[PDB]
Design a binder for this molecule. Sequence first.
Ligand SMILES: NS(=O)(=O)c1cc2c(cc1Cl)NCNS2(=O)=O
Ligand SMILES: NS(=O)(=O)c1cc2c(cc1Cl)NCNS2(=O)=O
Ligand SMILES: N[C@@H](CCC(=O)O)C(=O)O
Ligand SMILES: N[C@@H](CCC(=O)O)C(=O)O
Ligand SMILES: [Zn+2]
Ligand SMILES: [Zn+2]
Lengths: 258, 258
Amino acid sequence: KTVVVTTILESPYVMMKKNHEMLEGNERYEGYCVDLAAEIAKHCGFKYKLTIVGDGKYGARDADTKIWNGMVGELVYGKADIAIAPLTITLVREEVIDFSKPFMSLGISIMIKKGTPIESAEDLSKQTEIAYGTLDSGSTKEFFRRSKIAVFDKMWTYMRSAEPSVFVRTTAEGVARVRKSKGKYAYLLESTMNEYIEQRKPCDTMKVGGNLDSKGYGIATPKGSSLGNAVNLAVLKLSEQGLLDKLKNKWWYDKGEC
Amino acid sequence: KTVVVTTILESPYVMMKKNHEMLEGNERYEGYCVDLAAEIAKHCGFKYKLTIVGDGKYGARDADTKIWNGMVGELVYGKADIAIAPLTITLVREEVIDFSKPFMSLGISIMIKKGTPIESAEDLSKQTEIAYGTLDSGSTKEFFRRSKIAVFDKMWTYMRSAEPSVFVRTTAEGVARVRKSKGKYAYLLESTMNEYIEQRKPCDTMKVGGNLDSKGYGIATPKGSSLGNAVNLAVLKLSEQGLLDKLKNKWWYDKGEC
Ligand SMILES: NS(=O)(=O)c1cc2c(cc1Cl)NCNS2(=O)=O
Ligand SMILES: NS(=O)(=O)c1cc2c(cc1Cl)NCNS2(=O)=O
Ligand SMILES: N[C@@H](CCC(=O)O)C(=O)O
Ligand SMILES: N[C@@H](CCC(=O)O)C(=O)O
Ligand SMILES: [Zn+2]
Ligand SMILES: [Zn+2]
């Protein structure tokens, strides 16, 4: 049976290939995770079909209804067999689905326009001139909503009660806000996405500070799935052979424009 | 029933407290892993005895007989119900034991005496005057034995055939050799341990270059054990509450000497 693979559109993990309205199947796509789905598949020995996630979110449980949206949801309600994507391993998610070991490391970092008077997270908390928010429906938002640290609680208290909303719907949207906002908007996003943007034209963004925390992206399968075992091992193999780090070079740096 | 926790002596994960003879049971020990295991045991609601693995090793497999030694063996062969140490998640191990998600990140690094004319793993591979070795029966040794990267196979080639042996039985021995060799021995060891040593008197060693790869420390449990699960959620919990980041700063940095 062809494995159905859910994933989300996020450069440079998965990206529409210049000509698509063309080729077809999995060929439509390219990017770090597309490349990873290929070797994963070969080593586990299965055929697969990439499909992009509907609502285009990563996945939170909606407090109201208690329904899972996003890629996590696609797994939880049986619409897919596996998620290969920038999907953060977190306690709440590990409760409803199974995670492989991490294939990539990352942490919550700050993005600012170059020339912004900001050096750290402590720095953002101590001020009002510069607004900051996070993506909606992701790890980073929850990280704040649930944190017990001095700086991170205040930061949250601000973000949840600010108007207009400091939250964006997509990473692209949050990046464009930084640029358009003339250095009066910082964006809290994960490190890997920061470092990637920092390397793209027009080169007006930059990542400042040390990460606020430490975590990783795992590949996801339905809780109690049989793939969960092979897939995991596939990840370990590919890591020790050097693949994951060779691929990070290919999509992050060997492509640099800065 | 009391959970037998196996572990190894390795600064600053597990250490004999300055009252080595005067105290008893778990009290004898202090350190990063001693604190971690305490919170693990609190959050999973069990009691435990810490014992130190006998052959003071981490765990490799005899190619002769195929028997496991060190902590991996203590799990494999029933002598212990869990291993709480700086034990590295690798692929051969993950075949015979279960690993929690990472609780700490690390990579392979070079330690040299200050002043040594080395900058990278490649610089080492390009000469013979300076000898370089690694801990025996560890993740690192296996990394080289199994690496297909040009620079690492040539390193492995030199190490596997060097005399006197470039290998060492304890990280402590490896360090001693670096110091006493007047900069003619370098030691390939894990970034974590390196960062720690760097900040202790006599302050004569120094981490160099970047990390030769990425990986992590996991809590291991016998394949298909009941603790395996509880233990994992426990790690995930503690990582979010920040404890792991707080713990690390206590043992590595609030402990600095240079
Ligand atoms: N250094 S890390 O925690 O980001 C990491 C851990 C593992 C990887 C990859 C990374 Cl980057 N894959 C192989 N095994 S692991 O310990 O889960
Ligand atoms: N970035 S990492 O691979 O070193 C890492 C991964 C995890 C942590 C902590 C770290 Cl530093 N704990 C929570 N879940 S995780 O993905 O296993
Ligand atoms: N990548 C995150 C969401 C985006 C963010 O919060 O930065 C996740 O997998 O949940
Ligand atoms: N942490 C390693 C041992 C130390 C090393 O290999 O440098 C292991 O789990 O085997
Ligand atoms: Zn298009
Ligand atoms: Zn606690």
